[PDB]
Write a protein that binds this ligand. Structure first.
Ligand SMILES: CNc1ccccc1C(=O)O[C@H]1[C@@H](O)[C@H](n2cnc3c(N)ncnc32)O[C@@H]1COP(=O)(O)OP(=O)(O)OP(=O)(O)S
Ligand SMILES: [Mg+2]
Ligand SMILES: [Mg+2]
Lengths: 262, 1722
């Protein structure tokens, strides 16, 4: 009836479409918005410098989440304000739902006189609620690291809203910290997850000061093409340098060596 | 020139290029016959008869040639007919030549004869030649041909010492030490396109254009560009260059001759095809079959039938058009033969050449060749190895190979003729055209020129096969009937831009002039209808003026639309751009750079970068063929860099082809492989152009991406590949899995040699990989941050190489890029090129640059040093600002009080008021404020005010107060520049000595001549070091502490180069004032200082006495404009300022005088002419001549410069170092008179120029340093001085000055010209020579004293206000001591190692003899240390001259190698030879300049002023060794040095006369008087007056000059006695008394006209016997009428010794007396 062998399949890798899409991320850095109305006034006010935030958007991907650790201090006379001074990129991989950081926290001389303020991460879709997995990730970090106090550390989400980027920031609750430790359900709606597990914090973008980045000494930060070489127990040290974009050549050496291989 | 049309250039283009056929018909020689066979038509042309001469034609034997040229014809008995008719025009005239002959006639030797005539013009007496004077360019069309010429010409001229080389310099020494450059037209085009202050084109005396009929090819316009550029540059410079054209015999050769400026009656030589070496029987086969595959085998049928007609009888050379068809056809017509059993004709005889053809096809190792070589056949192409190709031609030359299939490469680069030549098809794939096209005309003529061995064959047989429709073309080409036309209308925009970038074409009329030199223009005049010009139009325009301007107008618009040029349609002017320069310098078409300018953005992807490259117009003809889309789509699915565009687009194909080439993928499509070669061989310069664009724009991320892509294209590998494979000799099988073990490459540095073996699981590759890991280039970085202000940061970057050098992988150099990036790695704050030379591969390198900072101190900056060549070779240094201590903000200035102008009457002194009352009525506001503190006080005062604020008068206020207080008070005035001291001297000598009858002096630099003037003068003017010499002896000199007033001018120069000396002397005057009880008044003057309070406290001036004014209170207001300029290439940027210089004159001062400062002397005259032609094009000529026509010739025609006369006649002068002092004075007078409005002064003259202007223009702020061969920024102190000249108080309401700078230097000048200047100390880097002087004078006796001495310095005050600048990390008191003690510890440790000082018990220091000599004569401790090593007991004049030369004092004044040979040939002009001298040292440079001055050799203009600087330090160094030799007890060497003192003074030798020092003395008077034998100077003072015109009588005054010299010739009476000759013991008190007497009084100083400084008589009294070579006692004295000397020695035990008394001078020769003792020991 039908003559088969009619048409031949042609491989169309999906990472190419995202690589082309990642090259236009710089346009979103001119229109970055912060969730405003809040409930307000109270906690610490976290001030994020624009230069590292724009760089954090440029090195990311539209669907695979990336994360960086927050470090900073307070102004000399104003303890209720937290200026974010450094973002640390560590070996990581992620999905559309979460990221996978190692167990070890950043440890370096430059950061020892700064206090950790939490972590910032991207996500594809703007959401009204903090991710239940973000609550689990933040709580499991607090359980293993007493330097992360629940009243001092936050979770900044950089949502990809069409032609823009929206920043909302949350902190954990004692109820949220307690449930996040026990949670072994990665599903998008586990049992026990409630809106009572977090609150919003006030966040301000500033041009008055500049932050800086810290990246792995050897290595790099993006392991989304080398997930085998990523392990939760992996160790790493840092250097004072700016990070490479997501699809930089050093993050996907197999694409360059397997193409050259005959 | 206004009503014109815009043309369509592409409609004027000959599309077929070289295949264009201008002749409508073709006439064939007698005996031709066309034959119609089935499928194809044959055309036969019989061989031509070399019709037997006629008139005189003797073959010229090389014995008759000029003798110097016979060595180039060694191995040749007699020239052929072509060379013999050309040899006199070639060897005996400089006429431009054009020689057309069939290929093989011997045109190469005719060019060799012109090359020999050029070589003969520079043959020196030595036998060798002068490599400097000349350079020869041989332009060959093919790269393969260029290489053969390098060997041939190199061997023929090897006996001359001539070097011939091809491209070795594009990749950068390139061209120098290379007298004959062989190159392609394109290569010479790009080399001469980036014309800097070069060392190439000006040395070019001869250009040979071989195969100049290339003009008809698409590459032809390159030859038109070369000739036009050379010929037009001839008339601009009026320096001749000889052009030689060698062409085939084709029509329009007379137009070619007009194009080369060849006189047709002298240099035109045309020889038809009858002059072929062997006659040629031509056969042309034209196929009518149009279907592809039947025509394919028809072609394969005609080749076989033709091969069979020569099998066995003749070798046959078959040409095809690929590296693949060479073996494919050679097999296609081998097997066809076996099919018919038709090889008994080739081989098949058991011949003596059958086994050799076999037996060499086993040591063959070529698979395809060994398949074919045994059975007669063979192939040859570039893909085969060198010995493989040399194999096939060694057999073919010995007549062993019968069938050889090759391509065009063999025809060009090898001399391999065959009896029969077959051209199988004339179609070749062109990737540039993107299609198949016909063969070029040059390839056809070269291949068929190989037919017929010029010795064997009575005839050659050339067979050409092609399509029937191209028969008429190839008959036209090979039978002298294909005319040569110009293909230049296509390339016109790109070539016009190349002349705009060079500066040769600055407007439309320059372009019309330039176009008139093009071969297109000559062809347009002769055959206008071929070039779209009606004869109706040609006479409405006889010389095609309107037509050329239309072409230029059309071309200029295209350049303007693409942003290469700014075209001003009204004036027709052209403005150069950076984009236009990059297009010219990188050989990029103008459409491509427009695409780059449109799409390049700093946020660019690697995806878009590859896409932008694929859109370059060089690939405009590339298309995606349907038969290629499958292989292309298979790659698009796997490429590492994604491609957005569809495979339908040709840009996607170009993109994939580039990615495949980097990954080293081999493709299948024949077009794809050739298309890949074309895109990638263009990717080099294309991507290198993109790199220079984004680098000079500061785009950090894109610069890193483009520079990497450049290296990935060159190395053919991605970053992910392990960088070890960049070593080609390293096995490609170990790297295999070193990549696959996923671990960083930086880990192998920290491992041994057998750990790498187990980590990779290959212990056999132990040390081999460890070897290359540490051969990979690697640099370690360190910084010392030095804050200047709170907004400007100075950085000293130390680069330490951390890799072992190897020439076989690194070469002679290794280049890097230094990049300074901001916080976000987004903006390049600063960048520069860094070159690690092999000779310094193990030394640390220091780099300094400025960087802006702002005050919420950024987290950090980054300093990357990436390689220019190596992939994955980079070191980034984070520059943290966490612990950076910024200096404090400078305090507000002292307000300028609104006081009423103070009249000159306030001095209240008639004689004092008499010095100013004429010049001006009232003092300026700045002189008014300080008046009471200076004139009515003794407090130390600091006056800081801008240049031109009248600070010279306030210093005079303190001088006049000193004259009131004491009658014989002494003032010492210090100014940092000698040029300033000479002008201050001229002013103050007239005001204080002429009018008020005091004594004003100017220090010489001669110690003893100076010392008198301090006791003689009331105002001593001196430079810092000329007062350091004097004040060092202040505890022994009373004329140093008696000083009432010490005034130091321009004290802000303590931060400059020679600042540390200015810091020591004033610090000494403050310490001297401490020891005596009467303070010495100190007045400090400076330009506006930000840290003025530091200088005041350091100089002990109270707050109310410190006047810190800022630039805003300058008396005459200063309007400062700072124009930025984008171009990073200096010569192009200087061009971009030419018209802005003129436009700034008309805008800011069209009426009042203007000074223009330019970087170099050559630029002075260039811009002076540039201003004039712009004024003439403004039809405002002679606007700058406010004087007249004739009142000026009483000033003109007094100069040697011809251009200086023309410039002044139009109102513009210029000043530079090369003009004689009389010319500079006269140009200044015309400028100050208002006669001339503009003067162009060099940067070197900004300190010694006594003229001012209303407007000053600083054209650029850099200058080239000849030593380090790099551009250096103007010191900020020189810029302040230049701006100071824009100030005329009683002439102009304001002052204006425009500073044209590079864009990067703009904000720097804004921060340090509008704000006051911060100054620092650098005494910590110049501590040794001063510490040694204090050890000698016992001011420092221990290490605690050294710390105490430093507390008196400006350095001590600054290292607590700005600690990081001096590498302090805290202003603690202990951080100060540890810093001061460490400086003290090393400085004294260096001195004692040099044996200058002695240290006892880690604490006490005491001077040694070496240190006492270095301090006494002001010599570097490093110099006097090397003197003791070199000098010994047997040194005379030739060793003294040797080691005095290589001293640290002479080192840093440049070495120019436009004189590498004069000094090589002056070494061949000296009495004393050198041992293995190499003429690369600024020290051996002086050694021969010293020998030249003693030889009285006039060398060059300002080489002489260079030896004036060598002579100013020679006497002090000679006396130093005199001290060294005598201290060691050596007699013979000391007296030889004591006579070179008088040798270097009178410029004579010991071999020479004594009467050589009398004035006006003729040359040969040394033998003159030998007939009488009277050579004494003695004589010539005592003869009788009517003949005491002894021998010679010269004028009424030239004897009165001999009279004054004889009257001040030293006539000294010597009385000597040994006190108590009868009471001497064996080692007791001994005393000898010598008494001197001047039979005279004294008539001023020594008479030495050949010596700059005026010296005074020095004398040595010497004792010691010459038998033992022992000096026992020596003393120095100055005579002056009568004096006695005493020598105390020690008796040498017992005996009867007899010593010898020497009395020697240091100035005159011929007075060294000699008496011998009368002793008696007991
Ligand atoms: C040698 N002569 C000249 C030759 C060519 C062109 C100009 C002059 C010239 O004469 O002009 C000088 C000065 O003679 C004069 N001047 C001073 N006081 C003045 C007053 N109260 N009214 C009016 N004019 C006054 O104004 C210029 C400031 O020159 P200076 O004194 O050198 O200013 P500086 O601060 O730069 O001193 P300095 O240590 O750099 S040399
Ligand atoms: Mg030739
Ligand atoms: Mg001054």
């Amino acid at each position: 009836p039908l003559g088969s062998m009619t048409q031949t399949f042609s491989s169309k890798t999906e990472w190419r479409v995202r690589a082309i899409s990642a090259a236009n991320l710089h346009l979103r850095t001119n229109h970055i918005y912060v969730s405003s109305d809040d409930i307000k006034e109270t906690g610490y006010t976290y001030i994020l410098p624009k230069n590292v935030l724009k760089k954090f958007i440029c090195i990311s991907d539209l669907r695979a989440q990336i994360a960086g650790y927050l470090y900073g201090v307070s102004p000399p006379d104003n303890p209720q304000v937290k200026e974010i001074r450094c973002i640390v990129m560590v070996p990581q991989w992620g999905t559309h739902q979460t990221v996978h950081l190692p167990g070890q926290l950043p440890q370096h001389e430059y950061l020892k006189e700064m206090e950790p303020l939490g972590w910032i991460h991207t996500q594809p879709n703007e959401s009204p609620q903090l991710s239940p997995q973000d609550v689990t990730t933040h709580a499991k970090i607090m359980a293993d690291n007493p330097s992360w106090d629940g009243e001092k550390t936050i979770i900044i989400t950089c949502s990809f809203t069409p032609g823009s980027c929206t920043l909302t920031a949350y902190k954990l609750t004692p109820s949220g910290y307690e449930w996040g430790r026990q949670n072994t359900d990665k599903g998008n709606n586990p049992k026990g997850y409630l809106p009572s597990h977090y609150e919003r914090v006030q966040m301000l973008l500033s041009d008055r000061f500049l932050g800086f980045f810290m990246v792995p000494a050897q290595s790099s930060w993006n392991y989304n093409f080398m997930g085998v070489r990523h392990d939760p127990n992996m160790k790493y040290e840092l250097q004072l340098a700016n990070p490479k974009e997501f699809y930089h050549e050093v993050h996907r050496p197999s694409h360059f060596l397997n193409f050259a291989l005959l | 020139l206004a009503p014109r049309q815009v043309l369509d250039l592409e409609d004027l283009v000959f599309t077929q290029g070289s295949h264009f056929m201008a002749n409508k018909r073709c006439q064939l020689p007698d005996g031709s016959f066309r034959r119609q066979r089935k499928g194809y038509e044959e055309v036969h042309v019989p061989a031509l008869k070399p019709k037997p001469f006629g008139s005189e034609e003797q073959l010229l034997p090389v014995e008759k040639l000029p003798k110097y040229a016979q060595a180039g014809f060694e191995g040749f008995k007699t020239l052929n007919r072509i060379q013999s008719k050309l040899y006199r025009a070639a060897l005996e005239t400089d006429e431009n030549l054009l020689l057309c002959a069939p290929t093989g006639a011997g045109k190469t030797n005719v060019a060799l004869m012109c090359m020999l005539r050029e070589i003969g013009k520079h043959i020196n007496m030595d036998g060798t030649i002068n490599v400097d004077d000349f350079k020869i360019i041989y332009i060959a069309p093919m790269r393969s041909l260029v290489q053969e010429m390098v060997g041939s010409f190199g061997k023929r001229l090897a006996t001359y010492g001539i070097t011939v080389a091809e491209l070795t310099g594009d990749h950068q020494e390139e061209i120098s030490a290379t007298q004959i450059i062989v190159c392609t037209p394109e290569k010479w085009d790009i080399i001469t396109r980036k014309g800097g202050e070069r060392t190439y084109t000006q040395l070019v005396r001869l250009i040979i254009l071989d195969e100049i009929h290339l003009l008809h090819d698409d590459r032809g316009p390159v030859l038109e560009a070369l000739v036009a550029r050379a010929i037009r540059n001839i008339e601009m410079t009026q320096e001749d260059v000889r052009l030689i054209g060698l062409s085939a015999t084709l029509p329009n050769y007379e137009d070619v001759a007009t194009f080369l400026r060849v006189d047709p009656a002298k240099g035109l030589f045309y020889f038809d095809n009858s002059f072929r070496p062997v006659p040629l029987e031509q056969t042309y086969v034209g196929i009518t079959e149009k279907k592809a595959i039947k025509r394919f085998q028809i072609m394969n049928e005609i080749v076989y039938e033709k091969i069979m007609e020569h099998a066995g009888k003749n070798q046959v050379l078959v040409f095809v058009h690929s590296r693949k068809e060479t073996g494919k056809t050679a097999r296609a017509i081998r097997d066809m033969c076996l099919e018919k059993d038709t090889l008994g004709l080739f081989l098949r005889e058991g011949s003596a050449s059958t086994e050799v053809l076999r037996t060499e096809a086993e040591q063959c190792k070529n698979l395809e060749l060994k398949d074919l070589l045994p059975y007669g056949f063979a192939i040859h192409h570039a893909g085969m190895t060198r010995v493989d190709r040399t194999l096939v031609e060694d057999l073919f030359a010995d007549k062993h190979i019968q069938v050889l299939v090759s391509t065009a490469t063999l025809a060009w680069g090898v001399n391999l003729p065959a009896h029969t030549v077959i051209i199988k098809g004339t179609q070749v794939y062109s990737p540039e055209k993107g299609r198949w096209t016909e063969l070029g005309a040059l390839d056809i003529l070269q291949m068929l020129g190989r037919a017929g061995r010029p010795q064997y064959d009575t005839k050659g047989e050339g067979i050409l096969i092609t399509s029937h429709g191209e028969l008429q073309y190839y008959l036209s080409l090979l039978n002298q009937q294909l005319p040569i036309e110009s293909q230049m209308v296509s390339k016109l925009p790109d070539m016009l831009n190349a002349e705009i970038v060079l500066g040769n074409v600055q407007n439309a009329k320059d372009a019309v002039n330039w176009l008139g030199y093009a071969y297109l223009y000559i062809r347009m005049l002769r055959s206008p209808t071929l070039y779209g010009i009606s004869h109706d139009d040609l006479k409405g325009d006889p010389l095609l003026d309107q037509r050329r301007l239309d072409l230029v107008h059309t071309a200029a618009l295209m350049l303007d639309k693409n942003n290469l040029v700014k075209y001003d349609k009204k004036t027709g002017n052209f403005q150069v751009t950076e984009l236009g320069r990059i297009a010219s310098h990188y050989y990029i078409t103008n459409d491509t750079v427009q695409t780059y300018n449109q799409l390049l953005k700093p946020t660019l992807s690697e995806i878009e970068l590859f896409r932008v490259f694929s859109l370059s117009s060089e690939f405009k003809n590339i298309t995606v063929r349907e038969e290629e889309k499958l292989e292309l789509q298979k790659l698009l699915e796997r490429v590492p860099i994604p491609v957005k565009e569809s495979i339908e687009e040709p840009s996607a194909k170009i993109n994939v082809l580039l990615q495949a080439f980097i990954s080293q993928l081999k493709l299948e499509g024949f077009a794809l492989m050739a298309d890949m070669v074309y895109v990638t061989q263009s990717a080099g310069r294309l991507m290198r152009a993109i790199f220079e664009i984004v680098l000079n724009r500061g785009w950090a991320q894109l610069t890193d991406k483009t520079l990497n892509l450049c290296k990935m294209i060159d190395k053919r590998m991605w970053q992910s590949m392990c960088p070890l494979r960049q070593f080609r000799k390293l096995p490609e099988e170990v790297v295999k899995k070193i990549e696959k073990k996923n671990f960083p490459f930086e880990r192998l540095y920290d491992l041994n040699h057998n750990e790498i073996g187990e980590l990779i699981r290959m212990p056999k590759m132990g040390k081999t990989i460890h070897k290359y890991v540490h051969l990979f280039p690697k640099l370690e970085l360190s910084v010392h941050l030095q804050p200047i202000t709170r907004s400007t940061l100075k950085v000293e970057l130390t680069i330490t190489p951390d890799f072992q050098w190897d020439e076989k992988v690194h070469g002679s150099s290794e280049a890097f890029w230094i990049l300074v990036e901001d916080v976000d790695s987004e903006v390049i704050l600063h960048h520069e090129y860094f070159l690690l030379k092999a000779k310094y591969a193990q030394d640390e390198h220091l780099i300094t640059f400025f960087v802006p900072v702002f005050e919420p101190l950024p987290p950090q900056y980054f300093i990357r040093v990436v390689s220019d060549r190596w992939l994955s070779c980079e070191t980034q240094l984070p520059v943290s600002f966490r612990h950076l201590i910024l200096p404090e903000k400078y305090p507000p200035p002292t307000e300028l009080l609104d006081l009423q102008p103070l009249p000159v009457s306030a001095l209240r002194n008639s004689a004092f008021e008499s010095l100013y009352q004429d010049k001006f009525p009232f003092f300026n506001p700045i002189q008014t404020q300080v008046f009471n503190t200076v004139y009515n006080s003794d407090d130390n005062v600091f006056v800081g005010a801008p240049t031109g604020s009248g600070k010279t008068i306030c210093a005079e206020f303190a001088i006049l107060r000193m004259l009131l207080q004491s009658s014989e008070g002494r003032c010492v005035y210090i100014t940092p520049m000698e040029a300033l001291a000479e002008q201050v001297y001229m002013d103050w000598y007239e005001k204080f000595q002429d009018r008020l009858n005091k004594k004003v002096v100017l220090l010489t630099g001669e110690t003893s001549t100076d010392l008198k003037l301090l006791g003689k003068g009331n105002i001593i003017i001196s430079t810092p070091e000329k007062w350091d010499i004097l004040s060092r002896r202040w505890k022994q000199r009373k004329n140093v502490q008696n000083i009432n007033l010490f005034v130091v001018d321009e004290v802000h120069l303590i931060g400059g180069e020679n600042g540390p000396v200015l810091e020591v002397i004033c610090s000494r005057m403050r310490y001297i004032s401490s020891q005596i009880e009467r303070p010495i008044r100190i007045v400090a003057l400076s330009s506006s200082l930000s840290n003025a309070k530091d200088v005041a406290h350091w100089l002990g001036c109270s707050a109310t006495s410190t006047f810190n004014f800022h630039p805003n209170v300058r008396p005459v207001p200063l309007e400062l404009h700072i124009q930025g300029f984008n171009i990073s290439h200096t010569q192009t940027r200087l061009l971009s300022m030419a018209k802005p210089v003129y436009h700034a004159i008309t805008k800011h001062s069209p009426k009042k005088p203007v000074i223009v400062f330019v970087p170099s002397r050559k630029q002075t005259r260039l811009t002076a002419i540039d201003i004039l032609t712009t004024c003439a094009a403004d039809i405002q000529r002679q606007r700058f001549l406010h004087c007249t026509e004739k009142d000026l010739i009483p000033y003109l025609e007094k100069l040697s410069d011809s251009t200086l006369k023309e410039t002044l006649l139009n109102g513009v002068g210029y000043l530079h170092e090369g003009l004689s002092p009389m010319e500079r004075r006269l140009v200044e007078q015309l400028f100050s008179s208002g006669a001339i409005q503009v003067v162009v002064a060099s940067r070197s003259l900004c300190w010694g120029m006594n003229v001012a202007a209303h407007l000053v223009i600083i054209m650029d702020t850099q200058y080239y340093n000849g030593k380090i061969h790099a551009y250096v920024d103007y010191p900020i102190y020189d810029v302040l001085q230049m701006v100071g000249h824009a100030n005329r108080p009683l002439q102009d309401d304001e002052g204006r000055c425009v500073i044209m700078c590079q864009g990067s230097k703009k904000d720097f000048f804004k921060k340090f010209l509008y704000e006051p200047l911060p100054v620092e100390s650098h005494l910590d880097h110049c501590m040794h020579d001063h510490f040694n002087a204090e050890i000698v004078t016992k001011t420092i006796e221990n290490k605690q004293d050294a710390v105490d001495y430093l507390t008196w310095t400006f350095l001590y005050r600054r290292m607590t206000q700005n600690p990081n600048y001096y590498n302090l990390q805290g202003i603690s008191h202990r951080h100060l001591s540890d810093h001061l003690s460490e400086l003290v510890e090393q400085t004294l440790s260096d001195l004692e190692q040099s044996k200058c000082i002695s240290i006892e018990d880690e604490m006490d220091v005491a001077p040694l003899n070496l240190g006492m000599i270095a301090a006494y004569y002001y010599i570097n401790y490093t110099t006097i240390e090397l003197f003791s090593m070199s000098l010994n007991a047997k040194t005379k004049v030739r060793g003294l001259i040797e080691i005095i030369s290589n001293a640290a004092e002479y080192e840093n004044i440049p070495i120019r190698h436009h004189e590498d040979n004069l000094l090589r040939q002056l070494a061949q002009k000296v009495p004393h030879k050198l041992n293995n001298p190499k003429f690369n040292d600024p020290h051996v440079k002086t050694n021969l300049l010293l020998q030249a001055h003693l030889s009285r050799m006039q060398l060059s203009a300002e080489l002489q002023s260079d030896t004036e600087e060598i002579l100013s330090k020679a006497i002090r160094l000679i006396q130093a060794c005199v001290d060294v030799l005598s201290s060691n007890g050596w007699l013979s060497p000391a007296l030889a040095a004591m006579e070179l003192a008088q040798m270097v003074t009178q410029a004579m030798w010991s071999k020479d006369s004594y009467l050589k020092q009398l004035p006006h003395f003729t040359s040969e008077h040394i033998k003159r008087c030998t007939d009488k034998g009277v050579e004494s100077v003695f004589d010539i003072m005592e003869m009788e007056d009517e003949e005491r015109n002894a021998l010679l009588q010269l004028t009424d005054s030239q004897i009165a000059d001999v009279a004054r010299f004889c009257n001040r010739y030293p006539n000294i009476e010597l009385s000597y006695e040994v006190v108590d000759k009868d009471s001497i013991r064996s080692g007791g008190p001994v005393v000898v008394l010598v008494q001197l007497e001047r039979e005279e009084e004294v008539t001023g100083p020594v008479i030495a006209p050949l010596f700059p400084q005026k010296r005074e008589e020095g004398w040595w009294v010497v004792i010691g016997d010459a038998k033992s070579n022992s000096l026992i006692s020596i003393k120095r004295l100055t005579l002056q009428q009568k004096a006695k000397v005493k020598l105390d020695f020690v008796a040498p035990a017992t005996g009867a010794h007899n010593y010898t008394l020497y009395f020697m001078s240091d100035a005159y020769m011929g007075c060294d007396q000699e008496y011998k003792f009368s002793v008696d020991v007991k």
